[PDB]
Subunit: 123 residues, 2 copies
Amino acid sequence: GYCGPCPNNWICHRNNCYQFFNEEKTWNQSQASCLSQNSSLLKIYSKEEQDFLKLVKSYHWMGLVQIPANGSWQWEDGSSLSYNQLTLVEIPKGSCAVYGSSFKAYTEDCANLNTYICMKRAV
Amino acid sequence: GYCGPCPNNWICHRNNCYQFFNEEKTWNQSQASCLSQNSSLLKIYSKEEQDFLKLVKSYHWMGLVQIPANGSWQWEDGSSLSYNQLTLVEIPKGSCAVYGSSFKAYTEDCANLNTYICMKRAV
């Protein structure tokens, strides 16, 4: 069958759309860049349905952030981080997270410059 | 727009279809597995149009083999390996090649067991 719809030249899988950007930006600028293209930073909503992402090397900003008050990690769509989605390595002080392959994420200072991955959840 | 057509749950990009198999097989068994699903082992026909593949980690069988006589490397579709497609590291004796990320390939004994990537070139 066909996969989509998706922005031109984006990778499509189960109707989810992904694109990898190597221009480095802060977490906020990365999220903004994704939003300007009608998407959001990468969200791992299901390891089973996003299996190939385990093969993505290096580190990239994803849509996982820390809440100021309670300090609870949640995705940009407001949903909360679940145990079965990925293994988050909480390294001191950082309030944003980079995806680091193998369904593992690492906390970092949001002002750090990183490449990033945008995703459009299917409808 | 839409991307495809592609086998169910395969990754689609510019209408090319890809799937990553972690069950390890010899080069021949890997090619056969791809063929049985109407595809062929991964071919890098254009670094520009297959850019995201630079991010694929580990090593996987691809459709690049050595010809018995002249010993010229060519893809499975008969086309010849071009300089601008990838950097092939010819390590002694092997007649098959594994893709090793960053558009680099490494020669290996075809009987080695490796994970593999299948691809359906667009039409």
